[PDB]
Coordinates of C-alpha atoms and ligand atoms in Angstrom, one line a residue:
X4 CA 52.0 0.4 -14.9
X5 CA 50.7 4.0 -15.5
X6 CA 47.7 4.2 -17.9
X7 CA 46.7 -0.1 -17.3
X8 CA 46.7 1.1 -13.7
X9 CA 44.3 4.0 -14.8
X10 CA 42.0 1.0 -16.0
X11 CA 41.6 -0.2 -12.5
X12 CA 40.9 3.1 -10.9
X13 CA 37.6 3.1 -8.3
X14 CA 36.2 6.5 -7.8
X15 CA 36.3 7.8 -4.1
X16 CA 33.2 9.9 -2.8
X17 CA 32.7 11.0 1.0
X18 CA 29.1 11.6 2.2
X19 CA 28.7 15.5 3.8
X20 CA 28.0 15.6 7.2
X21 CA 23.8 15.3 7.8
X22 CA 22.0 18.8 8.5
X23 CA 24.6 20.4 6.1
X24 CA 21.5 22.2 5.1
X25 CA 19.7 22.9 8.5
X26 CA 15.7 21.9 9.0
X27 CA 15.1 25.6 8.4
X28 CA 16.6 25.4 4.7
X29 CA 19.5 27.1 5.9
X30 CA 23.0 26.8 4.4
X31 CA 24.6 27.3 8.3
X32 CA 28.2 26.7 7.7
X33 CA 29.7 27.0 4.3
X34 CA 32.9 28.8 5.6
X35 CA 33.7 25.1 7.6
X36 CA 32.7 23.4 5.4
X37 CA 34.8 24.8 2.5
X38 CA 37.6 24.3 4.3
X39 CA 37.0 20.1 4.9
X40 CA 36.0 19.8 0.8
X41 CA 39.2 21.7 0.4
X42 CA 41.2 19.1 2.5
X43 CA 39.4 16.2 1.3
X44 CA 40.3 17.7 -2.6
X45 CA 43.3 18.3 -1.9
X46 CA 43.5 14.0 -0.7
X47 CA 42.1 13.3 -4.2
X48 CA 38.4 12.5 -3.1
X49 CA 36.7 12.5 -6.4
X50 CA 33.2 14.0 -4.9
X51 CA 31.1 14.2 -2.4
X52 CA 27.3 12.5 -1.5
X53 CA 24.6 14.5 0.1
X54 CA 21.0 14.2 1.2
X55 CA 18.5 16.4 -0.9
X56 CA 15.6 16.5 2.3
X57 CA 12.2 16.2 0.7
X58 CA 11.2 17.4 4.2
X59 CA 13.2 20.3 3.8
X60 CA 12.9 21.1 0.1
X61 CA 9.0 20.6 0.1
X62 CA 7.8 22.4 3.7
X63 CA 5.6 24.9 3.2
X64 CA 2.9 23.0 1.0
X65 CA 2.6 20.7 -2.2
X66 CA 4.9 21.8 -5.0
X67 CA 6.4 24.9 -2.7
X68 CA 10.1 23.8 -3.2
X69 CA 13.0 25.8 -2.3
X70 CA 16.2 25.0 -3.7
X71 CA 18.6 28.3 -3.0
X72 CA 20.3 26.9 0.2
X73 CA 20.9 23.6 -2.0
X74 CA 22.3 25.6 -4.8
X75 CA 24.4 27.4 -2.4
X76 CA 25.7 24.3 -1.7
X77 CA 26.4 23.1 -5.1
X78 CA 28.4 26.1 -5.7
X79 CA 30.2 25.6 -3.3
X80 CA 31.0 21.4 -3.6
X81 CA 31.5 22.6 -7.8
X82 CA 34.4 25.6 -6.6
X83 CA 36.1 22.9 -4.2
X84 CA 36.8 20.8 -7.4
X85 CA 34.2 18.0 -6.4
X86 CA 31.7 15.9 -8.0
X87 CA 28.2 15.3 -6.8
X88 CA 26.2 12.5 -6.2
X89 CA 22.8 13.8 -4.7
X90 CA 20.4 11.7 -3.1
X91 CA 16.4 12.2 -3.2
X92 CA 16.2 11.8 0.5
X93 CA 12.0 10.8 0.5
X94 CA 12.5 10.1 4.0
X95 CA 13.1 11.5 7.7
X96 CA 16.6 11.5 9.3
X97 CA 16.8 10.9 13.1
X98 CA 15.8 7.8 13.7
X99 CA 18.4 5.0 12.3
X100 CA 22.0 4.3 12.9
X101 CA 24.2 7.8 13.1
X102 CA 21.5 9.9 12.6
X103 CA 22.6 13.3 14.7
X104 CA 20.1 15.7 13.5
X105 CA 16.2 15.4 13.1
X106 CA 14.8 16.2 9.9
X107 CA 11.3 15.0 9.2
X108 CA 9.1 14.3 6.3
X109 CA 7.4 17.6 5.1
X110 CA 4.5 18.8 7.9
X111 CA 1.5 18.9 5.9
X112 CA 1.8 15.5 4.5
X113 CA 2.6 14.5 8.5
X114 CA -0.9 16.4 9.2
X115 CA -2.6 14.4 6.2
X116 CA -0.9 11.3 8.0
X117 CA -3.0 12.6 11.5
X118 CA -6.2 11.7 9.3
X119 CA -5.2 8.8 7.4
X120 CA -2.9 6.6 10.2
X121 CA -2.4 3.6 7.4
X122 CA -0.1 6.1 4.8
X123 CA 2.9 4.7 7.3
X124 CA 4.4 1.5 7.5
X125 CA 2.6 -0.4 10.5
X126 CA 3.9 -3.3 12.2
X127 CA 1.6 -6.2 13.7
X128 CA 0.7 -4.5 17.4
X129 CA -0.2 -1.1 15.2
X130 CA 2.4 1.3 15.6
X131 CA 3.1 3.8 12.9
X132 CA 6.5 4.4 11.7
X133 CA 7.1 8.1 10.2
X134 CA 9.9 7.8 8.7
X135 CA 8.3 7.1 5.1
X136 CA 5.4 6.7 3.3
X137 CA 4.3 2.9 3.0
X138 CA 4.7 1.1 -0.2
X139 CA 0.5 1.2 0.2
X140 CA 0.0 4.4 -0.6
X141 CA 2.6 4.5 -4.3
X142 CA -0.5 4.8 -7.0
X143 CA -3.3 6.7 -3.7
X144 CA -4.1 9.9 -4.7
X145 CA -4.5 10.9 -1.1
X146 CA -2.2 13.8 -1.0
X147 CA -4.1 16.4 -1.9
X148 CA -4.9 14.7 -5.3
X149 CA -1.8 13.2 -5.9
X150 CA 0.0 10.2 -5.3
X151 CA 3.1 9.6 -3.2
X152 CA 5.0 8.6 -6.6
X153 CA 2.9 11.2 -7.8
X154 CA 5.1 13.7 -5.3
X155 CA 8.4 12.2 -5.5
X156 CA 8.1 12.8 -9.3
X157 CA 7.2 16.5 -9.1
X158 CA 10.7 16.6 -6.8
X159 CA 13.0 14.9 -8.8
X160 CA 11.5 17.4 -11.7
X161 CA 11.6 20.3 -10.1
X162 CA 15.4 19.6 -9.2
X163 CA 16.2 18.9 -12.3
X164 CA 15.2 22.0 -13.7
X165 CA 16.5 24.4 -10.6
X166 CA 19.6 22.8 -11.3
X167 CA 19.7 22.6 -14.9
X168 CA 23.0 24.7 -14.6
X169 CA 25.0 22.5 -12.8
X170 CA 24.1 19.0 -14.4
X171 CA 24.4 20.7 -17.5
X172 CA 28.5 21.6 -16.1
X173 CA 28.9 17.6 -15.4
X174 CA 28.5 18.4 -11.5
X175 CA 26.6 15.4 -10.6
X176 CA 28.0 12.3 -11.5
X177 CA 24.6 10.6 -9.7
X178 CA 21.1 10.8 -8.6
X179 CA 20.7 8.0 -5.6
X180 CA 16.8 7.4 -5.7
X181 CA 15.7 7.1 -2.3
X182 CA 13.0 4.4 -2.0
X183 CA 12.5 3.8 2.0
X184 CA 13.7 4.6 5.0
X185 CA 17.5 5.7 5.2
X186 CA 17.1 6.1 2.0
X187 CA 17.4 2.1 1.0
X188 CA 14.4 0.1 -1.0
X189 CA 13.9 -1.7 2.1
X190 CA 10.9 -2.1 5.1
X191 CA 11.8 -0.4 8.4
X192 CA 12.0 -3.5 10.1
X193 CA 14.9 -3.0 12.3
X194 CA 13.7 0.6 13.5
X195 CA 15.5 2.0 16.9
X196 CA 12.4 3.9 16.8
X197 CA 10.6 1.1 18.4
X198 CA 13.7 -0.4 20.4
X199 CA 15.3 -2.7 18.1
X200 CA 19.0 -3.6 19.0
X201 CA 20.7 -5.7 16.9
X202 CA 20.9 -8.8 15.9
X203 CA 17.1 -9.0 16.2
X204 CA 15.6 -10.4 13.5
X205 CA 13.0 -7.7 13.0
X206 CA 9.9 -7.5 12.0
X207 CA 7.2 -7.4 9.0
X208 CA 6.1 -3.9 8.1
X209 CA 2.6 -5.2 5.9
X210 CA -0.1 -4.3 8.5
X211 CA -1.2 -0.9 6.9
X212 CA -4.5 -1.0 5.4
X213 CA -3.2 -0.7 2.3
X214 CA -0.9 -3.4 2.3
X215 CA -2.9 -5.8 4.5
X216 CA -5.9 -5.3 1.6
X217 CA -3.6 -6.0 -1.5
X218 CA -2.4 -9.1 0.2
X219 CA -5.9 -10.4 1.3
X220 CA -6.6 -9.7 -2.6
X221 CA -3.5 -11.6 -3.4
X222 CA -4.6 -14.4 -1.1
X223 CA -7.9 -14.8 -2.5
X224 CA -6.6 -15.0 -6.1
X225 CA -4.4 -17.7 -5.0
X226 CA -7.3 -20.1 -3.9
X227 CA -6.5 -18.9 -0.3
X228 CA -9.0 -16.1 0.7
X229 CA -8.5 -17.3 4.8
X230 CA -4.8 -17.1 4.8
X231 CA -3.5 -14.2 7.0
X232 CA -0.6 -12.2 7.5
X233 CA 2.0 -14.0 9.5
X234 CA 1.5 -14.0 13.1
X235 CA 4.1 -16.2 14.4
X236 CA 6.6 -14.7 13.2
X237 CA 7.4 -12.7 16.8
X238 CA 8.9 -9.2 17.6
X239 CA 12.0 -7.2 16.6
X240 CA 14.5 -8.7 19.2
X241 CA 13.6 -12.1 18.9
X242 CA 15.8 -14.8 17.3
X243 CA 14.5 -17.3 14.1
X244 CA 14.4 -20.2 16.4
X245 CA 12.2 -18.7 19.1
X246 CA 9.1 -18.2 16.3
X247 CA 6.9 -20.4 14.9
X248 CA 7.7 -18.6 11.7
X249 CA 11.5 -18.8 11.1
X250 CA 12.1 -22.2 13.2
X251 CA 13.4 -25.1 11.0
X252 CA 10.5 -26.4 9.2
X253 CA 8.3 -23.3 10.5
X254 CA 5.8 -21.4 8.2
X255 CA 8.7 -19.6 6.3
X256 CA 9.0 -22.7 3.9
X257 CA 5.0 -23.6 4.3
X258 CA 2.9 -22.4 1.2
X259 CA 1.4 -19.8 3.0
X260 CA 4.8 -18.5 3.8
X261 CA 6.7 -19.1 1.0
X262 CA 3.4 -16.8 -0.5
X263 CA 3.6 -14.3 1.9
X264 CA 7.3 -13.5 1.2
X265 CA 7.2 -13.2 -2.2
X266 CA 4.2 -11.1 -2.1
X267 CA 6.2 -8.8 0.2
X268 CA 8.9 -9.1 -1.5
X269 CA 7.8 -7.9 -4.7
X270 CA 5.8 -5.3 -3.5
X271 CA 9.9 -3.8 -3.1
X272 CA 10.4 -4.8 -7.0
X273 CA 7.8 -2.7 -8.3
X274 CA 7.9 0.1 -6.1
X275 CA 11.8 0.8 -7.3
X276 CA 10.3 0.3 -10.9
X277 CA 8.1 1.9 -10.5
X278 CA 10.5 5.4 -8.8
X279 CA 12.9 4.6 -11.3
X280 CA 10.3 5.0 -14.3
X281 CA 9.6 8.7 -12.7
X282 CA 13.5 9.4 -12.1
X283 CA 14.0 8.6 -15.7
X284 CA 11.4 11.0 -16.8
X285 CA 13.0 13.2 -15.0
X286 CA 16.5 13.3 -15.6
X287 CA 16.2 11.7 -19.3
X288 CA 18.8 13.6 -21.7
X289 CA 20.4 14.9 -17.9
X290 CA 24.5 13.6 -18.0
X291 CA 23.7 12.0 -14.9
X292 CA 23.4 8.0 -13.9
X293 CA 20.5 6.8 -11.7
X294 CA 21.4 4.5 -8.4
X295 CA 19.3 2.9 -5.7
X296 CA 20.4 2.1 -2.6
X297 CA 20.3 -1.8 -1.2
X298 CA 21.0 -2.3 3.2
X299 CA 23.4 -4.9 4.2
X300 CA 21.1 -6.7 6.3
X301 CA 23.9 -9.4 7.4
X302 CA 22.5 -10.3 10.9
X303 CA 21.3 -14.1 10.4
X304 CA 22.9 -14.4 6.9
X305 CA 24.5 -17.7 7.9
X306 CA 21.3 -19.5 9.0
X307 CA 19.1 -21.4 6.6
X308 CA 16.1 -19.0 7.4
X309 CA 17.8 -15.5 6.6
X310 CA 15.1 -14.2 9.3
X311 CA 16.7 -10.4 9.4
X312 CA 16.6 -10.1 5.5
X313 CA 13.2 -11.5 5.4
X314 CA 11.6 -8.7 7.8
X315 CA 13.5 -6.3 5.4
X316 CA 11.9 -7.4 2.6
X317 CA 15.4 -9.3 0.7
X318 CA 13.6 -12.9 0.0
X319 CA 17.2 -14.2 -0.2
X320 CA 17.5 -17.9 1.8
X321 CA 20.5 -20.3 0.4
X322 CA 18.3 -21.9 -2.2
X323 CA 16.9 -18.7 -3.8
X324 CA 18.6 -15.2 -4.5
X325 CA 16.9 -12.5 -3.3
X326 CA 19.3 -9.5 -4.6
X327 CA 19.9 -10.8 -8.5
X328 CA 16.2 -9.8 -9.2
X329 CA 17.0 -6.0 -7.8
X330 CA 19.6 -6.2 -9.9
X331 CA 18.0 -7.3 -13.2
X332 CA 15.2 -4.9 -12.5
X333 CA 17.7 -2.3 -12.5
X334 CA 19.1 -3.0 -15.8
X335 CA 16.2 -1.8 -17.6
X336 CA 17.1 1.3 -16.2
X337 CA 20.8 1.6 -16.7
X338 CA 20.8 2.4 -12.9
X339 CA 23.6 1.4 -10.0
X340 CA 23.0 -1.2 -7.3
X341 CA 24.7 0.8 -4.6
X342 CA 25.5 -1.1 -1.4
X343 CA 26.7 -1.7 2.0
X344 CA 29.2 -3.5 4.2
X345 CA 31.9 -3.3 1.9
X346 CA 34.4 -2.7 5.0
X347 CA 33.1 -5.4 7.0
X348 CA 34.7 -8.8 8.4
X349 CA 33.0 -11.5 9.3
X350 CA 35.5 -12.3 12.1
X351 CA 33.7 -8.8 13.8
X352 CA 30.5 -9.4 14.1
X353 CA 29.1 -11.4 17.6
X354 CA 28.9 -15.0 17.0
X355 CA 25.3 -15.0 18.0
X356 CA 24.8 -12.9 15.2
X357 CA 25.2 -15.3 12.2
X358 CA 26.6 -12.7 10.4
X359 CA 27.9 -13.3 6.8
X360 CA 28.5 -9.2 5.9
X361 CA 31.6 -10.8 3.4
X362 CA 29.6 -13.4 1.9
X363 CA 26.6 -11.0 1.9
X364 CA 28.9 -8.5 0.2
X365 CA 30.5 -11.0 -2.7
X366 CA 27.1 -12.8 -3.4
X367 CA 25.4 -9.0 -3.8
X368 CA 27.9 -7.5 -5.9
X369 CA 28.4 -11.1 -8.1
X370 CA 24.8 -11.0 -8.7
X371 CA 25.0 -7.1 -10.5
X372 CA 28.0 -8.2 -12.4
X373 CA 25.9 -11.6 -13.0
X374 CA 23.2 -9.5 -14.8
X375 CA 25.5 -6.8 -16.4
X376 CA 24.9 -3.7 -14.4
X377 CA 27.1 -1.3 -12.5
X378 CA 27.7 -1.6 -8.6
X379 CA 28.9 0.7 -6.0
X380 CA 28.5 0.2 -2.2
X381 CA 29.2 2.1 1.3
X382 CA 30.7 1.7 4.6
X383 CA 27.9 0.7 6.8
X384 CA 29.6 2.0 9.7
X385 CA 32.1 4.6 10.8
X386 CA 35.6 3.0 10.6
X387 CA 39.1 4.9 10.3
X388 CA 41.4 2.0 10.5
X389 CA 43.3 0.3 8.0
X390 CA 41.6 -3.3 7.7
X391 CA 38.8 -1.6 7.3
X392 CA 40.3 0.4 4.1
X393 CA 41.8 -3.1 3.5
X394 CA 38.4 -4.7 3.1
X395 CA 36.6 -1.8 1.0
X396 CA 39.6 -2.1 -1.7
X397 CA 39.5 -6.2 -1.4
X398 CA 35.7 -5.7 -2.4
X399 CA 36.1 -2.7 -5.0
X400 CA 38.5 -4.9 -6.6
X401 CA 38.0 -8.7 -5.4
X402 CA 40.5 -10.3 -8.2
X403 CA 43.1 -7.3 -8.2
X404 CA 44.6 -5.2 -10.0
X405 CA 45.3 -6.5 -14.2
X406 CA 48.1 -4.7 -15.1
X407 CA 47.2 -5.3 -18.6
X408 CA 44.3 -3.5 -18.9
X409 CA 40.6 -2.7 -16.9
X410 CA 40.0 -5.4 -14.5
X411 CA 37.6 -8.3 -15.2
X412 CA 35.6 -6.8 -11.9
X413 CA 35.6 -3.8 -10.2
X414 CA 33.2 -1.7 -8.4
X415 CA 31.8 1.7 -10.4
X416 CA 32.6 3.5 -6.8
X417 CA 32.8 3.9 -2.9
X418 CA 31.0 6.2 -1.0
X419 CA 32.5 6.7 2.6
X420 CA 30.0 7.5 5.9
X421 CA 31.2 10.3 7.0
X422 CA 33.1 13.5 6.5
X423 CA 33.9 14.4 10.3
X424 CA 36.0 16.3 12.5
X425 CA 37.5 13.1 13.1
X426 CA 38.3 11.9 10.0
X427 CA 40.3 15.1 9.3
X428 CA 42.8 14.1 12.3
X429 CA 45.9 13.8 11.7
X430 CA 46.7 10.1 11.5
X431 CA 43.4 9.1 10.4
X432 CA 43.2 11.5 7.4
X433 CA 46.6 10.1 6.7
X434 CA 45.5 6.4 6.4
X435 CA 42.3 8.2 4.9
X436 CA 44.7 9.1 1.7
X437 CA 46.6 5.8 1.2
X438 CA 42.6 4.1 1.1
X439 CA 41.8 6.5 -1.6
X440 CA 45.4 6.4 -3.1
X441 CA 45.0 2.6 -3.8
X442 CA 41.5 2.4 -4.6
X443 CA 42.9 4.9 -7.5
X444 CA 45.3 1.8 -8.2
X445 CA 48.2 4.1 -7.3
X446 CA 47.7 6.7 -9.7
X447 CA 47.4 10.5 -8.6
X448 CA 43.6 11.7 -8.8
X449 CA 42.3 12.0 -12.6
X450 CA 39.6 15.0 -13.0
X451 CA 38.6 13.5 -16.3
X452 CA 37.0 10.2 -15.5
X453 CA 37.1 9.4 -19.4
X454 CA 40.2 8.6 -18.6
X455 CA 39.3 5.4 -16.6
X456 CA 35.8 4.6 -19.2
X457 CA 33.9 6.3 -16.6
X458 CA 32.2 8.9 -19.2
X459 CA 28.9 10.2 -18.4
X460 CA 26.4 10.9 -21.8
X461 CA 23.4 11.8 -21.2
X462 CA 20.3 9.7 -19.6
X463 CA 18.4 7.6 -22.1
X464 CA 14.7 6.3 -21.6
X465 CA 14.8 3.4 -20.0
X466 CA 14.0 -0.1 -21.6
X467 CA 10.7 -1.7 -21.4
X468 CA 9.3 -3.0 -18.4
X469 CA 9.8 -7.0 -17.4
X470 CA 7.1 -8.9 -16.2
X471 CA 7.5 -9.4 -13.1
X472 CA 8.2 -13.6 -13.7
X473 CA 11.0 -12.7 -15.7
X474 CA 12.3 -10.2 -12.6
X475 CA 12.1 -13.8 -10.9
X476 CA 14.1 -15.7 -12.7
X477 CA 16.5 -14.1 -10.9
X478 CA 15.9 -15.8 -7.8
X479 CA 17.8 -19.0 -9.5
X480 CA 21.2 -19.5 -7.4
X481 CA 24.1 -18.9 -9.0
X482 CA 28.2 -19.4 -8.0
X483 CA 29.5 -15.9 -6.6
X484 CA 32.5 -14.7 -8.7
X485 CA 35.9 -16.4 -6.6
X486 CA 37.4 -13.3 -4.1
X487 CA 41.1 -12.9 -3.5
X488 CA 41.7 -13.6 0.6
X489 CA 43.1 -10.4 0.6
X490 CA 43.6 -7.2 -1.7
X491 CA 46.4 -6.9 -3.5
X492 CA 46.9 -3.1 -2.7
X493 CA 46.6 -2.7 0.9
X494 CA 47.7 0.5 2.2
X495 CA 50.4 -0.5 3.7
X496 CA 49.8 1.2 7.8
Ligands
LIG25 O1 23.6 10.4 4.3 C1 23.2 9.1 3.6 C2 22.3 8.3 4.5 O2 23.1 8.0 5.7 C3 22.5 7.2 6.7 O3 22.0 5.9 6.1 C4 23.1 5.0 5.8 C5 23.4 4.0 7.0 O4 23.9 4.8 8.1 C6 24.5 3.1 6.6 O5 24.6 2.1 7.7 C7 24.0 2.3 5.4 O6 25.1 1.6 4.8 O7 22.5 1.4 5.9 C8 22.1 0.2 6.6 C9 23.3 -0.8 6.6 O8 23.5 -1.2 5.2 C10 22.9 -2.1 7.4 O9 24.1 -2.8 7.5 C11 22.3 -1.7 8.7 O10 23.4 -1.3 9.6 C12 23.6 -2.2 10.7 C13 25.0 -2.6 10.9 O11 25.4 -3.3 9.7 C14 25.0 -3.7 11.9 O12 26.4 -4.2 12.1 C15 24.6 -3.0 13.2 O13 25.5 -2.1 13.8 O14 23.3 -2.3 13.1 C16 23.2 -1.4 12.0 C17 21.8 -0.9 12.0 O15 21.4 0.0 13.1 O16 21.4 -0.6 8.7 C18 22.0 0.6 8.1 C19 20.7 1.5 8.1 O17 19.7 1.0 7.2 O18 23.6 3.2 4.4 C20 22.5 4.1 4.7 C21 22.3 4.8 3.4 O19 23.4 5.6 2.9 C22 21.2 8.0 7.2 O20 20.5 7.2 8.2 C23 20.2 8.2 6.0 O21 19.1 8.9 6.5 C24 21.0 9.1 5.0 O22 20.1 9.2 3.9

């Protein structure tokens, strides 16, 4: 049912492979990679997602931005027939899942960081993590009189206007705010850096100066100047019931604990807002959406403690939602809640794990629909098989197709991890092309995404801020909207 089908189609985008643009701001390949955007057009892929390196963009010194390799890129993705959704990558590559090359955060902040050890997230026995400038130092202007906000404000500006052209041509369909590591408003807490293997439950990233004095503040102001960060709450490969924090009845659900974690918590609230205020700014009148990006932290989902989200800073437990707050904070801004796992079963995940990626998944996305905003979500891993397809187009569309008009939930859009050699095989770009054929609810790519009420008009100021109590009335459970078993158009391989 041609044009109702339309309704129901789910926009397809494939992330570029990482170091398209080299560490030396060097467009190295564009011959090869014409060639796989051409393929991947060619399978109806609506666009394309790629990291725009801060430590790349912003080497040489404090607003010294060069942008001509990017906007050789652009060109390039914008001939191929491909949309754009372009990420603010605040953060190093090389040191989480999949990373293959090593780009770092821009030298001379790395050399203020020599002086000043506390601008990176710290975990409890001291060690630094590079990857990203702690929530601590958002409003410091230690960086050579700015603020890290301050910087990542000046970038998003700056891009805008280099690239005025091509979001003026309806190029990019999004700007992904990075807000942590990998690009996710998260904690490092699970960093391979510091020899994390999963499931561990992590750790709390709060012991920079910064942090550690904002929460002593905190502390104080609550009646409790002698309470301390946690320390039971043991080290990243631990599991909940070996701590004194996460046991049943532990400190987690103690006052202290229960203070702690929303103190953390928030402190992930308000920086996003906070981003998000500056992206706005930026790209206000732009025909461009904003998004953030949320990690599927599903390790320990299904115990009562959530230890794994905890550590990342998701105060989500069974009796209090810890994503619906993102969500609502979002709103103001007329931003995306883009997230993970949307390929994942349950049913593959080690038992010991008490991993919930499904339910994870349905109460995430339930909880943006909950508070009327716009999701999208990712692969968290690389898959090429059809249950995982299966999955991504259960979740995209969890009631199905409604052949009489839009149905009454979809997702705003799929990113896949990763254009590869291997993804262009054969038999997997095959099954590659039924996924994106019936996430398009069997219609033949449609250039115009008017078509299926996904017009872009331009960026409008964001809504006034929310107190922060309101952001947490949020945290009140709610019923996840009822999922189909299975989709409804598999692809049939
Ligand atoms: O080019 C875009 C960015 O690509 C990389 O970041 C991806 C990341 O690779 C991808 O997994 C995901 O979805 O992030 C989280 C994920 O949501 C979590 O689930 C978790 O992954 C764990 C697996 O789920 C779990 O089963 C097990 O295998 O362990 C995994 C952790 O090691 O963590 C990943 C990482 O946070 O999205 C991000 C963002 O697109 C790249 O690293 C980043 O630099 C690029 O910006």
């Amino acid at each position: 049912s041609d044009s109702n089908m339309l309704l129901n189609y789910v926009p397809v985008y494939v992330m570029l492979p990482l170091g398209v643009v080299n560490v030396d701001n060097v467009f190295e390949d564009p011959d090869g990679l014409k060639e796989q955007l051409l393929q991947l057009r060619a399978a109806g892929v609506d666009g394309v997602m790629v990291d725009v390196w801060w430590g790349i963009i912003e080497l040489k010194g404090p607003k010294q931005y060069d942008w001509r390799a990017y906007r050789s890129l652009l060109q390039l993705v914008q001939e191929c027939g491909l949309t754009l959704q372009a990420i603010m990558s605040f953060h190093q590559c090389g040191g989480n899942v999949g990373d293959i090359v090593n780009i770092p955060i821009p030298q001379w902040v790395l050399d203020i960081g020599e002086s000043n050890h506390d601008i990176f997230y710290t975990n409890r026995s001291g060690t630094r993590n590079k990857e990203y400038l702690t929530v601590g130092v958002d409003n410091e202007p230690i960086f050579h009189g700015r603020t890290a906000i301050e910087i990542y404000s000046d970038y998003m500006k700056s891009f805008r206007e280099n690239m005025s052209d091509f979001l003026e041509s309806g190029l990019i369909i999004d700007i992904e705010v990075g807000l942590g590591p990998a690009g996710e408003l998260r904690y490092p807490s699970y960093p391979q850096s510091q020899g994390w293997e999963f499931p561990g439950i992590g750790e709390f990233q709060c012991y920079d100066k910064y942090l550690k004095a904002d929460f002593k503040a905190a502390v104080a102001r609550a009646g409790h100047p002698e309470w301390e960060l946690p320390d039971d709450a043991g080290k990243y490969n631990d599991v909940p019931e070996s701590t004194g924090f996460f046991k049943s009845n532990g400190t987690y659900v103690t006052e202290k604990g229960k203070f702690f974690l929303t103190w953390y918590s928030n402190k992930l609230l308000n920086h996003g807002d906070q981003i998000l205020d500056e992206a706005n700014k930026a790209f206000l009148g732009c025909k461009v959406k904003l998004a953030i990006k949320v990690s599927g932290i599903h390790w320990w989902y299904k115990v009562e403690n959530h230890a794994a989200e905890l550590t990342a800073g998701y105060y989500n437990l069974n009796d209090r939602d810890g994503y619906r707050p993102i969500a609502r904070m979002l709103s103001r801004h007329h931003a995306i809640l883009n997230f993970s796992c949307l390929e994942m079963r349950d049913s593959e995940q080690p038992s010991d794990a008490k991993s919930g990626p499904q339910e994870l998944v349905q109460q995430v996305l339930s909880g943006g629909w909950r508070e009327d905003i716009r999701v999208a979500g990712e692969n968290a891993l690389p898959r090429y098989d059809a249950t995982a397809y299966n999955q991504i187009i259960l979740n995209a569309r969890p009631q199905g197709v409604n052949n009489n008009g839009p149905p009454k939930l979809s997702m705003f859009g799929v990113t896949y991890l990763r254009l590869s050699d291997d993804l262009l095989q054969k038999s997997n770009f095959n099954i590659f092309k039924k996924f994106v054929l019936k996430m398009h609810a069997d219609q033949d790519y449609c250039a115009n995404p008017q078509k299926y009420n996904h017009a872009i008009t331009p960026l409008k100021p964001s809504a006034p801020k929310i107190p922060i109590e309101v952001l947490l009335e949020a945290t009140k459970p709610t019923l996840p909207f009822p999922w189909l078993p299975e989709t409804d158009m598999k692809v049939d391989g």
